[PDB]
Design a protein around this ligand. Structure first.
Ligand SMILES: CC(C)[C@@H]1NC(=O)c2c[se]c(n2)[C@H](C(C)C)NC(=O)c2c[se]c(n2)[C@H](C(C)C)NC(=O)c2c[se]c1n2
Length: 1182
């Protein structure tokens, strides 16, 4: 039902078609087993020609006729066999594929629209809950999974029956109890293989979980890189837990891996067992009773049936997932909650004009338990009036304003617009009649002309003009290139928040409702802009009854009536003066405020060599692999022999022949395999281990010893990075295992296939090889056309998706809701294109697939016919055809490889290339010399010469152009400028995180450019904006193991002492052993920073780098900070850059630098004596 039905819902001819194609499928599966019967009949007559050709010591002419008659006889049987099965195949396959698509196609598309629009209709709820980025995510993700649900399904049916009727058909109709001996031994052994192999395949997955755990405990926090460099390099830790848990779950998962190799060994062991019981039980049931040397037909066939069962399984799986996640989220789809709002008909209010009425409205947010912010609210506003609301505590003001848009619904009481109940009037009509301007001026990724269009569909640039002109925007818009026809560059991040809001107005203004609300929309914006804005508001208000919420009591003045609020508390209402004269709330407050990487440069064999390096040696590996190749050919021939001697040879010892070859095949494959595998498993496996481990190490280090523009200015987050760790270590592991499997299959197939290709008959040799490369090339072009169509498809659907996103994501549309559908409409457009495009491709796959099959029966019919060719009186055409099985299934061997084992070597290579280039690096500052920390460098006079720099992004114009400063010893070097850059960049330069473009610095003598980077970073005391510390124990944080700097207890104590954080150190559970607790999410920036300080001073710098240290704080925190900073400074050189135009006075040398160049400098009252720059700073400061 719902689950499956609803899943498979919608489709007149869709459904019908569906069934049809399905039928085709069935016939298809059945097609291959009947195919096996043919194997029979032809091979049977072949056998008879083998015993009459094996007699040979008698009539020569009777052999001419008898054997030739048999030739053209089966030659006819051949034509008709492949012809039938074949053409059929081509046809049926084509049909079904059409099923998959067409069906699922139309289906999806439908589900498409319905989901878009549904979402669009869940109202507030999609705000209420949801993660809304998550919502659309599943839009795309889930829909797709459903589609794949319908198509793979078709697949499942196909094979489901291939094995059902196959195993039946042959597995009964041809044996009557022999087909059964099959049934017995065959179905049985199949059970054992599937069984043990799955038990440890699952054991394998348990290995993948314990594995992911070792990995994270091998991940750790690697962000805060900066602070990190101003610290040195963890580098032991990472390695410690890294190789630790790795090595462990390595050998171990590599044990279960060698166990999956003990699995491939099991399966091949068991399979070998297949041969045992197979050939044995036959040998008997083919020597004694039922003598046809054909039984193999049945046995072999049904076996194939068990395999259909398997392939059947993954398809099913797909049906499941698609089904599942699809129907359950489809439930979150089709579902029509709605009702708390809607968008369909209603009560039409054409009376125009009216007054807002809030009569006893109690309300609680959707989050059930939350406290009813609107504990019975009574408020009513006349028309044409400008009524404001005042608040500050948060929640209620908005909440209410909100309700007025019938956004959520009242928990009790009612709201009457004009004189009717809002909940009565139509929603759209309502929402329309309601012009609102929240604060966030959300704009679209289109032309302005458009955003306004959105305001109201039909409309001429005429009106628009007027609107924008009444929304006072007609100007800047004109000065703006391209005019109204100008776009908003990818989202609304191109113009000034102000203008934006303005436009919104215009927009809403075009709406021209009769009710207006301003959710602080002036709020969060500079002054001047603010005033112009409010201006617009007014010109838009007073012609329309309005209500506003704002902390700008000023613009609140001209309030026709103020409402007393503060976090949900309805009190004093009335004109300004009345509340002021009310010495209460209004009055009160009035007086209180006064992940895309992807890189071209690959590496041909470059990875292999690096590969070989990271590889100690394991000829053993390649070796055993090789022999494994030799093994496949072995089996193939072993069979060719078996069937051979049996169908054409001497009557006595047919038993020892069978019993042997059979046992042979057994011991051979089985034993040789289990061993070849297991052993290789352990070897190559280890390779993967050390490689991954060692690899990570080197790499990560490369990062450690890496820096400069990298992390200082990264476009490579801590995630893409860590990921690099995991994913890429695994991938190189890939390059190795592959090279291994490569040589294997090769020599395997090539080497042996060819030696056999020699014992061949020159027929097959050429013909067949022609067939393998051919069919192979088909499989490759197939995969290519399939992924190509999949990629471009994701492209068109991407465009449609993104837009969809913009909408949903930006629900602030339902704000005006005059688009909902309109939106969805546009999508239908986009969607229409990739839809017709879908049908086309549908067909494609069809033909493609069907052609695969074509080459299938094709190549085997022409191959077998040509084989049998000339068998008149006993020519060079006999049992060797099995040797044909050899070369052919060897092609099937190559496919066993490019289809199994290691990754397709593609992404393995990418990730390899990446991880390499990275580990390569180009250090940039590591061991060195460039001095000797001579016992006379303890000065500090930092000297800045030329100072011309700009971090990698030079086309952004150097943020340091021709600069030069200086700071004596043991004093205070004040620093002030415009904002953001300049200050920091300077501190950094000292840290020499980026050697300037031209210039240099003298710590006190030698040249920092040419000074021992390390040491230069030994004596430094940076305390920047956002403080940070790993999740160690604070005693550990403090005792910042800079270098040899052993965790000196009385030393770190000394740190908490001067760092002023000893107040906490004293008590606070444990005392000095208190970890940062949860990574450091249990303290105030004042405490952290203090430790930051504790850091600095515990290092005993000779230079203090204060980068606007305390920018976000308060009270005794900024106080005890300026104190510890006061006692931690003056005893040594210290640059104090900041935005503390307040405690910037007490500075030995205040330097006003103007981004790029220095502008003023000197003692405070002197800089003040030079009125203008520094002056205008103390003045704007006020
Ligand atoms: C994709 C399908 C062909 C699929 N193979 C694999 O999933 C696979 C995974 Se590793 C692997 N095959 C390796 C490699 C060497 C292919 N094969 C062997 O060790 C081996 C030993 Se005897 C034998 N194969 C015969 C022969 C008829 C080959 N194969 C089958 O009865 C058969 C039935 Se379904 C199937 N194969």
């Amino acid at each position: 039902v719902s689950v499956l039905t609803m899943f498979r819902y919608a489709g007149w001819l869709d459904r019908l078609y569906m069934l049809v194609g399905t039928l085709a499928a069935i016939i298809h599966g059945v097609a291959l087993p009947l195919m096996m019967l043919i194997f029979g009949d032809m091979t049977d007559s072949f056998a008879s020609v083998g015993n009459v050709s094996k007699n040979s010591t008698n009539m020569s002419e009777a052999d001419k006729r008898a054997m030739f008659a048999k030739l053209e006889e089966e030659m006819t049987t051949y034509a008709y066999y492949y012809t039938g099965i074949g053409a059929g195949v081509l046809i049926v396959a084509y049909i079904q594929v059409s099923f998959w698509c067409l069906a699922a196609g139309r289906q999806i598309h439908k589900i498409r629209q319905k989901f878009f629009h549904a979402i669009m209709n869940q109202e507030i709820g999609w705000f209420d809950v949801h993660d809304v980025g998550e919502l659309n995510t599943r839009l795309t993700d889930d829909v797709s999974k459903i589609n794949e649900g319908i198509g793979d399904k078709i697949g499942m049916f196909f094979q489901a029956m291939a094995t059902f009727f196959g195993g039946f058909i042959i597995g009964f109709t041809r044996g009557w109890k022999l087909t059964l001996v099959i049934l017995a031994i065959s179905p049985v052994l199949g059970l054992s293989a599937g069984i043990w192999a799955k038990i440890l395949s699952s054991f394998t997955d348990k290995e993948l979980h314990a594995y992911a755990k070792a990995g994270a405990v091998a991940e750790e926090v690697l962000a805060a890189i900066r602070t990190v460099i101003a610290f040195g390099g963890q580098k032991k830790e990472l390695e410690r837990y890294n190789n630790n848990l790795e090595e462990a779950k390595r050998l171990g998962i590599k044990k279960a891996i060698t166990a999956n190799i003990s699995m491939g060994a099991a399966f091949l062991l068991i399979y070998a067992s297949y041969a045992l019981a197979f050939w044995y039980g036959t040998s008997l049931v083919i020597s004694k009773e039922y003598s046809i040397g054909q039984v193999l037909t049945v046995f072999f066939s049904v076996l194939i049936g068990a395999f259909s069962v398997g392939q059947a399984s993954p398809n099913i799986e797909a049906f499941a997932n698609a089904r599942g996640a699809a129907y359950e989220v489809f439930k979150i789809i089709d579902n029509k909650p709605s009702i708390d709002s809607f968008s369909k008909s209603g009560h039409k209010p054409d009376n125009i004009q009216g007054n807002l009425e809030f009569k006893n409205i109690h309300f609680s947010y959707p989050s059930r338990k939350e406290v009813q912010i609107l504990k019975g609210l009574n408020l009513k506003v006349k028309s044409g009036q400008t009524v404001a609301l005042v608040g500050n505590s948060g929640c209620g003001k908005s909440t209410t304003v909100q309700l007025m848009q019938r956004l959520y619904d009242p928990l009790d009481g009612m709201v009457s617009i004009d004189g009717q109940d809002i909940r009565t009037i139509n929603v759209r009509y309502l929402r329309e009649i309601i012009g609102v301007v929240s604060q966030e001026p959300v704009l679209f990724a289109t032309t302005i002309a458009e955003n306004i269009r959105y305001g109201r569909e039909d409309v001429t640039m005429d009106e628009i003009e007027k609107a924008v002109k009444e929304a006072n925007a007609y100007d800047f818009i004109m000065k703006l290139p391209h005019q109204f026809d100008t776009l908003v560059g990818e989202r609304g991040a191109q113009l000034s928040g102000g203008q934006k809001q303005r436009i919104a107005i215009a927009r809403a203004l075009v709406r021209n409702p009769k009710i207006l609300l301003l959710d602080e929309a002036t709020s969060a914006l500079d002054t001047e802009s603010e005033a112009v804005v409010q201006a617009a508001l007014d010109k838009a208000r007073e012609g329309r009854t309005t209500i506003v919420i704002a902390h700008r009591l000023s613009t609140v003045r001209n309030a026709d009536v103020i409402a007393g609020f503060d976090g949900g508390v309805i009190v004093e209402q009335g004109n300004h003066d009345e509340l002021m004269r009310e010495k209460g709330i209004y009055f009160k407050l009035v007086m209180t405020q006064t992940l895309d990487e992807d890189v071209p440069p690959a590496s041909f064999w470059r990875i292999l060599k690096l590969n070989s390096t990271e590889w100690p040696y394991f000829v053993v590996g390649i070796f055993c692999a090789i022999i494994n190749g030799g093994l496949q050919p072995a089996f193939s021939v072993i069979f060719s022999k078996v069937v051979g001697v049996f169908t054409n040879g001497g009557p006595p010892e047919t038993q020892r022949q069978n019993s042997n070859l059979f046992s042979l095949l057994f011991l051979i494959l089985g034993i040789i395999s289990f061993i070849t595998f297991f052993l290789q498993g352990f070897t190559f496996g280890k390779a993967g281990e050390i490689l991954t481990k060692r690899l990570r190490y080197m790499v990560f280090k490369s990062m450690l010893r890496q820096d400069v523009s990298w992390f200082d200015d990264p476009k490579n987050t801590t995630g893409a990075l860590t990921t690099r760790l995991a994913n890429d270590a695994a991938q190189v592991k890939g390059a190795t295992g592959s090279r291994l499997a490569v040589i294997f299959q090769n020599i395997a197939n090539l080497g042996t296939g060819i030696i056999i290709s020699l014992i061949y008959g020159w027929q097959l040799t050429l013909l067949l090889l022609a067939i393998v490369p051919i069919i192979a090339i088909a499989g490759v072009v197939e995969m290519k056309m399939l992924s190509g169509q999949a990629l471009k498809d994701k492209k068109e659907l991407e465009g449609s998706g993104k837009i969809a996103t913009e909408a949903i994501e930006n629900f602030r549309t339902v704000v005006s809701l005059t688009r909902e559908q309109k939106f969805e409409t546009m999508y239908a457009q986009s969607l229409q294109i990739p839809y017709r495009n879908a049908m086309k491709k549908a067909h494609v796959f069809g033909i493609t697939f069907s052609f695969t099959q074509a080459m299938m029966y094709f190549s085997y019919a022409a191959c077998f016919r040509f084989g049998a060719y000339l068998v008149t009186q006993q020519l060079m055409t006999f049992e060797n055809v099995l040797l044909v099985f050899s070369a052919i299934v060897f092609g099937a061997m190559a496919v066993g490889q490019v289809s199994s084992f290691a990754p397709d070597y593609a992404k393995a290579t990418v990730s390899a290339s990446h991880i390499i280039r990275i580990i390569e690096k180009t250090p940039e500052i590591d061991s060195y010399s460039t001095q000797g920390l001579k016992p006379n460098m303890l000065e500090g006079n930092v000297q800045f010469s030329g100072v011309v720099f700009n971090y990698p992004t030079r086309p952004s114009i150097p943020v340091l152009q021709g600069l030069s400063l200086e700071v004596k010893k043991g004093q205070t070097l004040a620093l002030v400028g415009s904002s953001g850059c300049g200050k920091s960049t300077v501190v950094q330069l000292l840290e020499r995180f980026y050697d300037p473009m031209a210039g240099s610095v003298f710590l006190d003598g030698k040249e920092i450019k040419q000074l021992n980077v390390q040491w230069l970073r030994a004596q430094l005391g940076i305390v920047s904006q956002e403080p940070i510390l790993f999740d160690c124990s604070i005693a550990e944080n403090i005792a910042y193991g800079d270098n040899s700097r052993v965790v000196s207890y009385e030393e770190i104590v000394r740190a908490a002492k001067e760092a002023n954080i000893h107040q906490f150190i004293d008590s606070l559970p444990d005392k000095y052993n208190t970890r940062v607790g949860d990574k450091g999410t249990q303290l105030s920036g004042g405490q952290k920073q203090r430790i930051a300080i504790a850091r600095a001073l515990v290092r005993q710098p000779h230079i203090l780098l204060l980068d606007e240290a305390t920018s976000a704080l308060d009270t005794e925190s900024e106080k005890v900070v300026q104190e510890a900073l006061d006692k931690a400074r003056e005893g040594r050189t210290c640059i104090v850059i900041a935005h503390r135009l307040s405690t910037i006075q007490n500075a030995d040398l205040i330097v006003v630098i103007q981004n790029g160049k220095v502008k003023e400098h000197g003692t405070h009252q002197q800089l003040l004596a030079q009125k203008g720059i520094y002056f205008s700073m103390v003045s704007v400061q006020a």
